[PDB]
Amino acid sequence: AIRRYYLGAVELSWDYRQSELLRELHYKKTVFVEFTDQLFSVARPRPPWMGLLGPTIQAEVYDTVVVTLKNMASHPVSLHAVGVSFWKSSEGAEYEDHTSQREKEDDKVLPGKSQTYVWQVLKENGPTASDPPCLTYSYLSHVDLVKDLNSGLIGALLVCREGSLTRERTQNLHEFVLLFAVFDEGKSWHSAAQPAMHTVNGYVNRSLPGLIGCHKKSVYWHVIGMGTSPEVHSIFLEGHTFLVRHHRQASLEISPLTFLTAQTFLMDLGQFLLFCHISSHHHGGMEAHVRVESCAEKHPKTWVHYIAAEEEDWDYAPLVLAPDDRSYKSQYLNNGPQRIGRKYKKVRFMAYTDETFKTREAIQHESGILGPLLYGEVGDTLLIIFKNQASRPYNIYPHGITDVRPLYSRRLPKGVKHLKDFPILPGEIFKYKWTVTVEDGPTKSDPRCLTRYYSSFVNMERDLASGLIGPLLICYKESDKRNVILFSVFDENRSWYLTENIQRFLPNPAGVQLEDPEFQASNIMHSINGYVFDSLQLSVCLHEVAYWYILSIGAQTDFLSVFFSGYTFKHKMVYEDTLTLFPFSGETVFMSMENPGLWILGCHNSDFRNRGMTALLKVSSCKRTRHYFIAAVEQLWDYGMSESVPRFKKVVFREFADGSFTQPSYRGELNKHLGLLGPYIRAEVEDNIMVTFKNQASRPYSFYSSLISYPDDQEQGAEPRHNFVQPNETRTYFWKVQHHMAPTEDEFDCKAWAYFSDVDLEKDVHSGLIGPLLICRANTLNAAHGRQVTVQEFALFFTIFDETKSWYFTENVERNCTLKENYRFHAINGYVMDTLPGLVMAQNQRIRWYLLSMGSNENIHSIHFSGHVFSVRKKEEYKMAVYNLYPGVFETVEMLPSKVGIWRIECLIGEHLQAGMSTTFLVYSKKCQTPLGMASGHIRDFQITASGQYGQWAPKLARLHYSGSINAWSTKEPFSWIKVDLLAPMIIHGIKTQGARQKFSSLYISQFIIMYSLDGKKWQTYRGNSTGTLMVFFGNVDSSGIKHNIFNPPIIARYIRLHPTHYSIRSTLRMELMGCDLNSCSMPLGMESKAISDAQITASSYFTNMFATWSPSKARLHLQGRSNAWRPQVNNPKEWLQVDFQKTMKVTGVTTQGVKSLLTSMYVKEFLISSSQDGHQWTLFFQNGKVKVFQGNQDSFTPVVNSLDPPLLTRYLRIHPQSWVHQIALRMEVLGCEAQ
Amino acid sequence: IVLTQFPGTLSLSPGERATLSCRASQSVASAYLAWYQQKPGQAPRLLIYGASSRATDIPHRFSGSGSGTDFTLTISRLEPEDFAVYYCQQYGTSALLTFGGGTKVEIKRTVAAPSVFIFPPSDEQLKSGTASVVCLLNNFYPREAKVQWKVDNALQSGNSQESVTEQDSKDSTYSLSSTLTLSKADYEKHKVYACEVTHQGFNR
Amino acid sequence: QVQLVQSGAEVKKPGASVKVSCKTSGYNFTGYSASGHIFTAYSVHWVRQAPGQGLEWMGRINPNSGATDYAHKFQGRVTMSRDTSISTAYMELSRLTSDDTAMYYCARADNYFDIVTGYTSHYFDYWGRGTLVTVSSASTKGPSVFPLAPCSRSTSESTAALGCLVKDYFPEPVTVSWNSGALTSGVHTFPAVLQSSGLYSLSSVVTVPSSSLGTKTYTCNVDHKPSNTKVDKRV
């Protein structure tokens, strides 16, 4: 059960120049090492290829983990766990947690300082069999993430199923880990050429000493990205099949920090290559030779496909869709002195019906450049005849194919080695055999349709750019046909025969300097299938559902964000807004075409869409009206007051409820956090969305949520939906959301979308016009609140905002300053670190967030649930603890905050995290609500302030239960403001107050509003519980009323000030707050009650006889009766009381109180504290190196509270009084909670 | 509650700062104290609200200050458009309201020669039955120059009346007229008719 | 464009009750209960001002709920009421006294508020013409106007003052023009003063050198609207 590890931080010298360190266990790097003894002397025998990776960490359900991270390195290190629960054991971060200095350790560590970081791994952390086989987080190090992970500190925190401690079937292959990483050595302090290095477990190109795989075994591979900058790279095994359970997955993917658990079943032997399948100029060298060795000792049918490669002239603009001749059009669809032109000659695959390969097929339009479709089934015996007719030897070889072999021979005895590079001379004809498996048993829920392609490998980087593409389909059955889309960038510079094109098309090749941007960009043309700049039409009849197979092979050198306007395309059981494809990968998209109109495609990228990579679809023809009078208002926005001043004019969505746009639905409690966002457009099944958008500002914008639909006005015609709502002009986008958008039963309760001004995405998301849509299943959003009320939800929108990328940059040159770097704000919901309020949630209540990313290629911000881990519900039940954000994807997540106190909502990417994509969030405890102590005198009289005494009527006597003559806060002016200057921000759970009596008149306040503030300048009225602009508190109507006031969303502030509205005669009130400290710990455990057994409380001596019954257990707070206190047998200064707590408890407050008996008052005035574990070891509670001598009480009725910043420890807590008044007796009760 | 304005009346050449102090009995916030302006024979106007902030479309020439029990309205430069009677005042709250003493603001006028006229009731007045002896004085110094119906060591009081002209909005002039409300015989019994004349330097 | 119109000059005898109206225009009848303390122009504040003294409060009426307060002097002397939908406030001044002759205005509280954070208004920025209320037990009296010319045997100064006295006339308002409007130079009008007789006295003069100039129509005109009389008299 219990696990324990003595890790450590070792400096070492690694210049990456010398690899294959076979003599290990012996640039500057700081790496995790593992030892085996408390002396930290002898290292555990470590495998020689871990390179720069730390150890591996196992765990199970409820299995504790005890890291002991000693800092041996020459500069401060830390520990930073991911996906495992604790209590400020391993927060790592230097930020505003507001915890006692006992927990401030992890922030900075001097050399040595072994420390101890314990985590518990509860049930919500540990997975099951149905969950992913073994969760694979990385327990990184955090004190300055960029330099910490440029120093190599990283590890593999694995957690999975119980029962794996025993080496029964778990020691197999030792569960070795893989860490595709991008280590930046240049920008560390270890400097005064150091390029970034792509590595696989720290080992650069092909020099990874021997990952050893098994012949015929299903193995789990554990992949952890690493990186502080964006950009990603796919991972491929050259000759190994990629299939996992029911996931139609072929490319294993990573991202600057992401965790994956691949599963691969091996059948063959030998050596393969782990390959970064990108031909980057400086990258793609993250290759490692994997070796697979011996670890230990029907419907058959005959089909043929004729296909031949030959050259042909193709244009991507079959029509003259370039009216403009100078703005970005003619440079890529016209021919001239410094540009290649419109149509070029490329070599394709086309079919020929005859054996002699003479008669071409009736090649159809819109199927440009792509080859014929292919299809196979169970028992297929397809054989493929290829012929070359081009000026070069070319060949085909499918990607990830099940089996590919030559024909008519077991092997080719001639000078042909393999089929992977065997060329075909001009005119020669060859035959290939592609075959699939046989013994794949039916499942009825297996991945039946998958998409891949085929190209040429005489020079892949030139074959793909030369046009060497054909499709390939794998579907199972046990109009109906559709051409596929191929997203690509075809480069003439990397084309085989650019010289032929330039000599044929440029009128004179005198000089182009080979470096002019226009010609170079024209070489790299962006194509959707074989077309660019509005050259597609995919009109398909309505009603019939659509099956598309969408691929992205080309030279895009980044990720895609392909989006369909007007529809959402069914993923595996989910309907997404925009979909992402890595290059050399694709997927089977399902769709419905019940929505007519004018719809255009695109990459959604800011620049790729403007590159003519658009295409048009052009389908054409073949209960309660839920209002949202949303508007677009202009605000002078300050992205944050941390490290400096952002004051830019931004535009934002604000919801209303009345036709007169007069109430901008002020940001109160729940909607405090939306920052630059807009309103929660919620809806259910069958509902009707009456969204009466209005617009403002100098420039008109509009509204769009992937659900708008142009009514089919002007039949026998088609135009884009007008939208584009002019200044001061309104519209009404009233539409009916369809039932195919409902999240499944297996899916989360309510899915979420993103809506924006689609008129120009790239220029107004930087202006902030973005907002969350919330389509939720069935009837689960009843009541006037229009929410599930069961779950508290919030909106996370991670995006970098660039002033130069917004309309208001000209308006934002106002401050004295010259580049976009000074105007980049890495915002979460428009606020950059330590600035986003409104994030408060209940620990007992499950909560939900709405995570989105909008924007450029940079927008790969990862999200880490700091201290929490949950279960995803897609298809089946799985678990996860770190999430990605692909631009355009709006996704629903959950992280129930069982651990109370401040936290962080973590963004992993080191460049971003040091830029500000994370800002705090606090979960409190509903157990603690004790009064802040206005009546106790703890809040002294000087703090409270108001105006208008005039009668010696100070407000300083506005405390509850106060009595005697003039005993309250009174003014005759109807406008008054009583300021409970708390001076320490805490969690205000409610207010309790009564009226006053003067002579015979009764005076009070019948109705009032509350104003709470943390800084004393910004001041917001409590607007919680919705159903109103703000809450008008039901005041008191009598001086003796029982008023049970609570706050549904509890205030978090340090000024809670009472503004009265309706009152009688005058204002004369006495008020007492109910609250708790920010960390939600200060609460009596139950010493006053019987939570502590009487046998646990004992005394050195206790006055017990026939008349005196002063037992030690009678020292409970507020105990009344015979000997309602403890008295000793002999009243001497050496007396002392023991209370047992059974273990160490954190106590920060102690309440002491005198007693009264025999018509006299008795109370101890001198006391000291001590702690012990067994009563033999003697440790006094050190208090600044002395024992503090208070005066203490002055009567026996008022209990006083004293704070202990260092929490007391041990199971035995000892109080030693010194001097007393009239006898020795006290009443005691402590305040605190559980911590370690 | 009780508001007092210091000074009671001030005369100043246009364009110069003028300061008017307000004193109360009650320790009141400066929010509940403001300053109004009234042109003679007209409705007044809001000038400064909250004792520190200026109201709608008023130039930054004016300002306010003070708190608690002492307030001050300060006009950096005053023009005849604003030469008026000004009121510090507490308003609205405590369910009761009251205004200030109304310090009339005047324009300094050079010391010129005053004009004096005296007219006994002529014959038409005598046969009208109203034999009112009248004396008027104009463009004088000071405004409060008090004259009385002095006849042969005899007071005439409790029966006369006096009309005082409002300060001129252009020349800041002043004029006073004293008339007797008495019958013919009451005038006829006396023989000498005159009202006393005071300056810095008639038959039946 | 907000209007706070009031009725014209009204004359009543002491001991009765005179009711003056204040019709509001330019706002919905209520501005909410100041639940947010935002727009408080609903509160109509009465005020009166005498010729010989500064303005002094009368009362407050809230149209939203009908609540009201009064100055301690007029608890039983002034009463307040609101219309239903005509947007007009009604004040009734009872137990009239002869000193009540004055100018009566109506107000509301709409501008700003300068406190820590509060945007209500407790300041008057809206204000009508002003109702002239005349209270006296005497009935209406005509233009007992008499001329005031320099004595023929005492006319030697270049400058000579001419006047006309409207005496014992009643009630207000009464106008006097000079030279029948032919000349405005040196034209002055003394304010009405309540004589010991209880009726009004007014004097209008011209200080132009009438002696220096020849015979000119120094015929001053007296206009009494309550009695509908015009008297042009040459001095």
Ligand SMILES: *[C@@H]1O[C@H](CO)[C@@H](O[C@@H]2O[C@H](CO)[C@@H](O[C@@H]3O[C@H](CO)[C@@H](O)[C@H](O[C@H]4O[C@H](CO)[C@@H](O)[C@H](O)[C@@H]4O)[C@@H]3O)[C@H](O)[C@H]2NC(C)=O)[C@H](O)[C@H]1NC(C)=O
């Ligand atoms: C892992 O292997 C990959 C192979 O795919 C390798 O990529 C290539 O590395 C070489 C490293 O030399 C790169 O060469 C660069 O380009 C110029 C012009 O060709 C070279 O001359 C340079 O090499 C010089 O470096 C030495 C030290 O400065 C010189 O003293 C000497 O004269 C060398 O000529 C320069 O490094 C090349 O661009 C890449 N990319 C390719 C070939 O596509 C990758 O670098 C390897 N990883 C590591 C960490 O070495």
Ligand SMILES: *[C@@H]1O[C@H](CO)[C@@H](O[C@@H]2O[C@H](CO)[C@@H](O[C@@H]3O[C@H](CO)[C@@H](O)[C@H](O[C@H]4O[C@H](CO)[C@@H](O)[C@H](O)[C@@H]4O)[C@@H]3O)[C@H](O)[C@H]2NC(C)=O)[C@H](O)[C@H]1NC(C)=O
């Ligand atoms: C579409 O958008 C908005 C509709 O809300 C509107 O822009 C706003 O117009 C108002 C006026 O209609 C602007 O208010 C101004 O505020 C300044 C602040 O000092 C005042 O000085 C202005 O008043 C002056 O001008 C008035 C008219 O000439 C005078 O009567 C007055 O006495 C002043 O001299 C004025 O009230 C407000 O600032 C803008 N806001 C924005 C964000 O633009 C716009 O006009 C609508 N229509 C069109 C065609 O755009």
Ligand SMILES: *[C@@H]1O[C@H](CO)[C@@H](O[C@@H]2O[C@H](CO)[C@@H](O[C@@H]3O[C@H](CO)[C@@H](O)[C@H](O[C@H]4O[C@H](CO)[C@@H](O)[C@H](O)[C@@H]4O)[C@@H]3O)[C@H](O)[C@H]2NC(C)=O)[C@H](O)[C@H]1NC(C)=O
């Ligand atoms: C602007 O001024 C207007 C007055 O000039 C002021 O009055 C508002 O009038 C509307 C319309 O009547 C009131 O709206 C109410 O809304 C509630 C629901 O919240 C309804 O139940 C009300 O209906 C009542 O009347 C029916 C017919 O008599 C009854 O059968 C029914 O049972 C209800 O009793 C009514 O429609 C609105 O409440 C008032 N406002 C106030 C403060 O009372 C309006 O408030 C002013 N606006 C602002 C912003 O100041």
